[PDB]
């Protein structure tokens, strides 16, 4: 019965989340580019460590990004085998500590910036609220157990020891609970379109998991 630890977002991050979840910006599909870039960055970090110490890869030898539609749940999962995040990393990097990126980006938006520039401010993760109203971040770093960070775009998030999801081995899986009007991002054809348009230059395989009935 793992303790659910509740934490408060810094005010700036709560402010940014509210802006994104409510914005009517047109090009919502850039969320996927931002999340694939975060995955690629985490994969770059384990590759760097493994160049010196190859044993760091033994927890999951393959380096990949994997997109898993869960149609019945209205959930889109994005998994990577990058370096992952410890419990402390999840609490520190995903809410409690003000990122400079938040304020500068919000000022840029007020001045006319395109929401698509969010990654240039280091806060591209929060673009998921363009298409989702709830997210779980499941992560496993070689230095810690597997943990789940969870938020509903409010001012609070939780961190819980993971006793309910598939083991990642090493890496991170985002579970996006999609809005009711954004279910196109569960479709194979649409996902492929978005990946090919915005994520052509990625050094890791981008795998798409598709479920089909075996016909008679
Ligand atoms: C806190 C917001 O920061 C960002 O939006 N991007 C920078 C970033 C990129 C990768 C990681 N990361 C590391 S280090 N290990 N795993 C990840 C990771 C993080 C995310 C988001 C939750 C930030 C992700 O979608 C995928 C990841 O592999 C952390 C921060």
Method: X-ray
203 lies in some domain: yes
Would you list the DSSP string of the chain?
Answer: ---EEEEE--HHHHHHHHHHHH---S-TTHHHHHHHHHHHHHHHHHHHHHHH-GGGGTTS----EEEEEEGGGTEEEEEE-SS---HHHHHIIIIIS--HHHHHHHHHHHTT--GGGGGGGT-GGGGGGGTEEEEEEEEE-TTS--EEEEE-SSSEEEEEE-SSS---SSEEEEEEEE-TT-GGGGSHHHHHHHHHHH-SS-SS-EEE----PPP-
Minimum-distance ligand 1 atom for the alpha carbon of 123: 5
- Tell me the CA–centroid distance for residue 215 and ligand 1, in Å: 40
* Domain count across the chain: 1
Residue 216 located in a structural domain: no
- Which atom of ligand 1 is least distant from the CA of 137? 22
153 within a domain of the structure (yes/no):
yes
- From the annotation, which residues make up the binding site for ATP? 38, 80, 99, 125
User: How many angstroms separate the CA atoms of 76 and 205, rounded?
Assistant: 18
Ligand 1, closest atom to CA 45? Answer: 14
Tell me the structure's resolution in angstroms, rounded to a single decimal: 1.6
Residue 15 lies in a domain: yes
Phi and psi, residue 39, nearest 5°: -65, -45
CATH code at 135?
3.30.565.10
- Evaluate whether residue 214 is within a structural domain: no
Domain containing 46 equals 4-208
Ligand 1 binding pocket, CB closer than 6 Å:
35, 38-39, 41-42, 45, 80, 82-85, 93-94, 122-125, 137, 172, 174
Q: Is residue 215 part of a domain?
A: no
């Amino acid at each position: 019965d793992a303790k659910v630890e509740t934490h408060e977002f810094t005010a700036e991050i709560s402010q940014l989340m509210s802006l994104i979840i409510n914005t009517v910006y047109s090009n919502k599909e850039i969320f996927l580019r931002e999340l694939i870039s975060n995955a690629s960055d985490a994969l770059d970090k384990i590759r760097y460590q493994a160049l010196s110490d190859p044993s760091q890869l033994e927890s999951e030898p393959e380096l990949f990004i994997r997109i898993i539609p869960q149609k019945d749940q209205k959930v889109l999962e994005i998994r990577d085998s990058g370096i992952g995040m410890t419990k402390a990393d999840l609490v520190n990097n995903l809410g409690t500590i003000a990122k400079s990126g938040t304020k500068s980006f919000m000022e840029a938006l007020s001045a006319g910036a395109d929401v698509s520039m969010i990654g240039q401010f280091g806060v591209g993760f929060y673009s998921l609220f363009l298409v989702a109203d709830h997210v779980q971040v499941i992560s496993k770093h070689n230095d810690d157990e597997q943990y789940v960070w969870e938020s509903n775009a409010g001012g609070k998030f939780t961190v819980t020891l993971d006793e309910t999801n598939e083991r990642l081995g090493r890496g991170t899986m985002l579970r996006l609970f999609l809005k009711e009007d954004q279910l196109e991002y569960l479709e194979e054809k649409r996902i492929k379109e978005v990946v090919k348009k915005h994520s052509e230059f990625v050094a890791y395989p981008i795998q798409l998991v598709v479920t089909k009935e075996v016909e008679k």
